[PDB]
Amino acid sequence: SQFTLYKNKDKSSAKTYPYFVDVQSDLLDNLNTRLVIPLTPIELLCPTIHIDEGDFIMLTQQMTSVPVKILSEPVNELSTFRNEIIAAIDFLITGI
Template sequence: MAQFTVYANPNRSTRATYPYLLDIQSDLLDDLRTTVVIPLSPLRLAGKAAISRLCPVLDIDGESYVALTQQLAGVDRKILGKAICDLGRYRSDIIAALDFIVSGI
C-alpha cells in the first residue's frame, strides 16, 4: 500500500458522505496490520464548513473532494480494496494539514 493512495470506502453506512479513504501512512510501516486514513467527502457536502488549511480540496477524476483531516482514523488494511488513484501530487497540502492539526502551524 502506497502513501497517498485512495481507496473506495467499504462501509456502506458512511459511503455516501465519505466515498473515499486516503491512506496517509508512511510506506516504511507496511508491515503493520493497520494504516492511517483520512476520509474524503465531496466538496458539495462540506461547503464552507471546511477549514481550507486543515481540509485541503483534492481532485479525483474531475470532482472535488475535501480531506477531512480532523477525522483521520486507523483501519485494518484488509478492509481496503482496490486502489482508485494516487494523490501524491497533493503531498505538500496533505502534510501541511497534518502539521496544522498536530502543531497548529
C-alpha cells in the same frame, strides 16, 4: 501505500466517506491497520480537492486508523497533493 486513494469498502460509511487517502509510511504497511484521511463530497486544515473521482473535502481533522480490509485496490495516485497533505497534518498537530 502512501498518498494512494482507496475506496471505502464499508458500505454504511461510504455514502459520507466514499474514499480514503492513505497517509501511513510505506515502511509500516505490513500492519493490519492504515492511517488515512477521509474524503467527503463537497455536496455533503480541510482543503477542497478536485480529482478524477470527484470534488471532495479532505477531512484532516477526522484522520483515523482503519482496518486494511476496508480498503479497495488502489483507485488513484494523490502523491501530487503530498505536501498539501503533510502541511494539513502538521497544522492539525502543531497549529503551524
